[PDB]
């Protein structure tokens, strides 16, 4: 309702996807770090991609 053609969908998708990736990685790493399991964010970011 704010932006026009290929800007409403383009920018809206970027905001949703960036927000989703940040929360997905945090949620996954919250489980393993509470159990003392150390995994580099590289591996989780590959799955979340």
């Amino acid at each position: 309702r704010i932006l026009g053609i290929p800007w409403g969908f383009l920018i809206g998708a970027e905001l949703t996807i960036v927000q989703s990736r940040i929360s997905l990685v945090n949620k996954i790493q919250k489980v393993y770090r509470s159990q003392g399991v150390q995994i580099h964010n590289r591996h989780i970011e590959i799955i979340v991609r």
Partner: peptide
């Protein structure tokens, strides 16, 4: 008024 294709207008509203 329609503004389809006017990138400068949408850049101003994005800011």
């Amino acid at each position: 008024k329609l503004h389809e294709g006017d990138t400068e207008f949408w850049k101003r509203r994005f800011l």
